Design a protein around this ligand. Structure first.
Ligand SMILES: [Zn+2]
Ligand SMILES: [Zn+2]
Ligand SMILES: [Zn+2]
Length: 70
């Protein structure tokens, strides 16, 4: 229920422990309210476009939702 579309220069966060593949990402809001802030995460700046995968159970091996969207 996030669905945020990233803007130019916006940080995106993946979790190296939980992402199903390297394109699985969270926006800043969802990352900071998720279990993955305590994991090995990777921040990549968006060039614009793409979207947050919070809530997609097929994107995450654990912790698919943040506290705001669960
Ligand atoms: Zn989000
Ligand atoms: Zn969320
Ligand atoms: Zn994780």
């Amino acid at each position: 229920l996030c669905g945020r579309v990233f803007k130019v220069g916006e940080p995106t966060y993946s979790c190296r422990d939980c992402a199903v593949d390297p394109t699985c990402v969270l926006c800043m809001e969802c990352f900071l309210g998720s279990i993955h802030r305590d994991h090995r995460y990777r921040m990549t700046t968006s060039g614009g476009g793409g979207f947050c995968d919070c809530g997609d159970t097929e994107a995450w091996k654990e912790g698919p939702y943040c506290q705001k969207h669960e």
